[PDB]
């Protein structure tokens, strides 16, 4: 259990194992602190993030923290849906020549929310390799948003569930303004059906757990 932080504590990275870390940032909204999780992947050919952060201020500092820790550059990011906590650092990414991967739909919705457009290069099942690190993206259907995807790391059996999966502490689904609450259950079932061997599940917000987080989210939807 190893967490690196900036001095304020607004940005932290937590070790799941040597090459996979959770990044978490606090964005403040009407006096209220909200954490958001993504992943940091340490690969032979650079660093890969799953999701950016609330804004460019945080995204830029996040990048510098990880580039210093691992002594190499952030080359790619995978955007799991078009909300601010996921997509708010797009300008930082473009400015630094960091490729922003997404589904066409996510790219479409990003444009329509006024954000810079990610690549729209991902299909519903896409396998990527960065150095020796394998990354699978999967669209399970509508849930938290229309466009939400999950990121699977087959070599670690680690699932970045994003906001499709709630933490164990969550007692409601949170922000459902853009959600499809009647399809969300099916969409989690598609995840459960596809990955029979989940060791860790990282939710969009809150503590890392395991396969249980997906069952908890199903309860929250009943
Ligand atoms: Zn969201
Ligand atoms: Zn979320």
Residue numbers in the entry: 36 to 257
Reproduce, without paraphrasing, sentences from the article in which this PDB structure was first reported.
The production of β-lactamase enzymes, which catalyze the hydrolysis of the endocyclic amide bond of the β-lactam ring, is the most common mechanism for resistance to these antibiotics. Class B enzymes are zinc dependent metallo-β-lactamases (MBLs), which require one or two Zn2+ in their active site for catalysis. Note, the 5/B/6 MBL, which we use in our biochemical and structural studies, is a different isolate from the commonly used BcII MBL (Sequence ID: EEL64219.1). In this paper, we couple kinetic and structural studies of the free and inhibited Bacillus cereus 5/B/6 MBL to understand the structure-activity relationships that underlie the inhibition by the 10-mer DNA.
To put the mechanism of inhibition into a structural context, X-ray crystallography trials were initiated for the aptamer-free and 10-mer-bound enzyme. The 2.5 Ångström (Å) resolution crystal structure of aptamer-free 5/B/6 MBL with both Zn2+ ions bound is shown in Fig 2. Subclass B1 MBLs display a αβ/βα sandwich fold in their tertiary structures with a consensus sequence of HXHXD(X)iH(X)jC(X)kH (in single letter code for amino acids where X = any amino acid, i = 55–74, j = 18–24, and k = 37–41), with H, D, and C residues coordinating the Zn2+ ions. Interestingly, our structure shows that in 5/B/6 MBL Zn2 has a higher B-factor compared to Zn1, indicating that Zn2 exhibits a partial occupancy in the active site pocket unlike Zn1. Coupled to this, the active site residue His263 is found to be in two conformations in the X-ray structure. This result suggests that His263 plays an important role in directing Zn2 to its location within the active site by acting as a gate locking Zn2 in place once it is bound. Interestingly, all of these residues are on the opposite side of the enzyme from the active site in three structurally adjacent loops (L4, L6, L13). Among these residues were three lysines (78, 104, and 107) on loops L4 and L6, shown in the crystal structure in Fig 2A, that make up a basic patch. The side chain amines of Lys78 and Lys107 are 11.7 Å away from each other providing ample space to occupy the loop region of the 10-mer (~8.7 Å distance between A5 and C6 of the aptamer). 200 models of the complex were calculated using our X-ray crystallography model and a hairpin model of the 10-mer aptamer, which was calculated in 3D-NuS.
